[PDB]
Amino acid sequence: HSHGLFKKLGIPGPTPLPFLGNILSYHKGFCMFDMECHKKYGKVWGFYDGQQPVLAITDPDMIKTVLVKECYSVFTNRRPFGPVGFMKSAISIAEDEEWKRLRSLLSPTFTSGKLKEMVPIIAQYGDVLVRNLRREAETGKPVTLKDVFGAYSMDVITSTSFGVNIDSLNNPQDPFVENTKKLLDPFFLSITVFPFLIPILEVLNICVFPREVTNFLRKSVKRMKESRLKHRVDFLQLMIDSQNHKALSDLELVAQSIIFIFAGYETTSSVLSFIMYELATHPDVQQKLQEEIDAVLPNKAPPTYDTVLQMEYLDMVVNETLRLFPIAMRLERVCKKDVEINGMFIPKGVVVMIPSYALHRDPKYWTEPEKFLPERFSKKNKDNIDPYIYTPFGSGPRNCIGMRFALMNMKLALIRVLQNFSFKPCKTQIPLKLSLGGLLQPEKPVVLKVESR
Numbered sequence: 001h002s003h004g005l006f007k008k009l010g011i012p013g014p015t016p017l018p019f020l021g022n023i024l025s026y027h028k029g030f031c032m033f034d035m036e037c038h039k040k041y042g043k044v045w046g047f048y049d050g051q052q053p054v055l056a057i058t059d060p061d062m063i064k065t066v067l068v069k070e071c072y073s074v075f076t077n078r079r080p081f082g083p084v085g086f087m088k089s090a091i092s093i094a095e096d097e098e099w100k101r102l103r104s105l106l107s108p109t110f111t112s113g114k115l116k117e118m119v120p121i122i123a124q125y126g127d128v129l130v131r132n133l134r135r136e137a138e139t140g141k142p143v144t145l146k147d148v149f150g151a152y153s154m155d156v157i158t159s160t161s162f163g164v165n166i167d168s169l170n171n172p173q174d175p176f177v178e179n180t181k182k183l184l185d186p187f188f189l190s191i192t193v194f195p196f197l198i199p200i201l202e203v204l205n206i207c208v209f210p211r212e213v214t215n216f217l218r219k220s221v222k223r224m225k226e227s228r229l230k231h232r233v234d235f236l237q238l239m240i241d242s243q244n245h246k247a248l249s250d251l252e253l254v255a256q257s258i259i260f261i262f263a264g265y266e267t268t269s270s271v272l273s274f275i276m277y278e279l280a281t282h283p284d285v286q287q288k289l290q291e292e293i294d295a296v297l298p299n300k301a302p303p304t305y306d307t308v309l310q311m312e313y314l315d316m317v318v319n320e321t322l323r324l325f326p327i328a329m330r331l332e333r334v335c336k337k338d339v340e341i342n343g344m345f346i347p348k349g350v351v352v353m354i355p356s357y358a359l360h361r362d363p364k365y366w367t368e369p370e371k372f373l374p375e376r377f378s379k380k381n382k383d384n385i386d387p388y389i390y391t392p393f394g395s396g397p398r399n400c401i402g403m404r405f406a407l408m409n410m411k412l413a414l415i416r417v418l419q420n421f422s423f424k425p426c427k428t429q430i431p432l433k434l435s436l437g438g439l440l441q442p443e444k445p446v447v448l449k450v451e452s453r
């Protein structure tokens with residue numbers, strides 16, 4: 001019944017099976033499936049995640065319209081995650097008026113002025129990461145980068161969302177480290193075929209996030225609120241002060257902190273691991289970046305908000321890695337009203353999809369794409385890229401609100417790790433075969449050789 005929609009609108013696409021749509025095509029992963037359909041079915045195609053109609057667009061003008069131009073009016077919210085409970089008030093999960101209220105109440109928290117005042121504090125746990133990196137350099141055996149980066153990513157997240165200056169890997173007993181370190185898949189794939197099961201799961205009070213960690217963060221936020229009763233450089237602080245549009249709730253503040261927590265842990269650790277692999281398989285970029293790191297700031301010169309943005313090559317290295325590996329893999333907006341965007345009728349309720357992975361590896365906009373060529377973002381070539389094709393943090397008023405923070409957190413960590421060690425390929429795997437699941441992480445871990453100086 002729903003499969004004739006994209007046939008009525010005259011939109012090509014793989015013929016879907018009843019009750020399932022095109023979920024069987026997800027056997028090669030979201031990324032492989034999106035690239036294949038872009039070559040065959042053209043610039044715009046449509047498929048079905050069960051009964052949910054999905055429209056893929058690649059035209060940059062349509063993309064701008066969906067993300068920027070007609071954002072508040074037609075394309076505002078994302079597709080329902082699933083059995084989310086009290087986390088429905090999360091800024092990434094809120095819809096329509098609650099999202100506009102939450103983002104305005106949280107936008108000044110990620111201001112360039114607020115990030116500069118937290119730069120010296122974000123380096124205390126970073127020096128602890130180098131201390132834990134020298135002991136691994138004493139061993140000639142390779143080291144998995146996801147655990148070391150996650151240890152740093154948890155320390156910075158805890159020390160920036162709250163005041164817990166910790167050594168996550170070296171102190172594996174604090175409740176803050178324990179809850180975060182504990183936390184496609186058979187569950188998420190079933191929700192796509194059965195969106196009718198989403199409201200039934202919430203009636204069963206079974207949410208996709210372990211409830212044991214939610215109550216632990218609820219009591220932690222309660223005791224931290226009692227600890228406030230001169231912390232002026234803290235995510236929560238900035239949320240409690242603005243609390244005392246409408247007002248921000250207490251449990252609402254608990255939900256957003258969990259967003260800030262996870263968005264800076266596996267997300268940051270994943271990108272940090274993708275960067276170092278490409279630096280290990282391309283040591284000329286590693287050497288030049290190490291040479292450029294010592295140029296703007298000599299050996300044993302601490303980074304600063306003004307100095308990080310000066311190293312031009314470090315920004316080129318993070319951009320190309322995000323291109324080759326956009327951990328989002330997709331951007332989604334729900335067409336909540338009948339709209340004709342760029343000569344195309346989009347009915348209501350249709351999920352409009354933007355394949356970041358496919359456009360990041362499209363030969364039309366990138367020459368030799370599968371090749372890590374960080375020179376694509378040089379001062380003379382960074383103007384040729386279309387900002388609506390390379391969207392690692394998305395775009396529009398619902399882009400990544402922590403883009404500046406995540407870029408600073410990773411760049412501040414990269415400057416200190418590269419000015420003390422070098423990374424050589426150990427036994428790793430050049431093919432770097434991506435995982436076939438719903439995350440843009442490698443199932444095979446990232447283990448390379450770390451050499452000192």
Ligand code: HEM
Binds near residue numbers: 271391398403
């Ligand atoms: C390298 C790291 C990161 C990448 C690549 C990234 C990328 C993205 C992307 C692609 C989106 C979707 C935007 C869209 O729908 O168009 C997003 C949303 C979001 N990100 Fe990030 N992100 C990163 C780190 C972070 C961090 C560290 C935080 C906060 C601590 C954060 C907070 C958010 C929030 C709150 C949203 C939802 C925006 C809203 O719905 O208003 N992100 N991010």
Ligand SMILES: O=C(Nc1ccccc1Cl)N(Cc1cccc(O)c1)c1cc(C(F)(F)F)ccc1-n1ccnc1
Binds near residue numbers: 267330
């Ligand atoms: O917000 C988000 N948008 C988004 C981006 C791309 C596709 C779909 C979506 Cl919905 N994601 C999704 C996300 C992003 C990266 C790694 C992940 O594993 C998951 C998010 C969700 C949570 C939650 F649901 F677990 F609470 C926590 C943090 C983030 N997140 C990460 C970076 N920026 C935001």
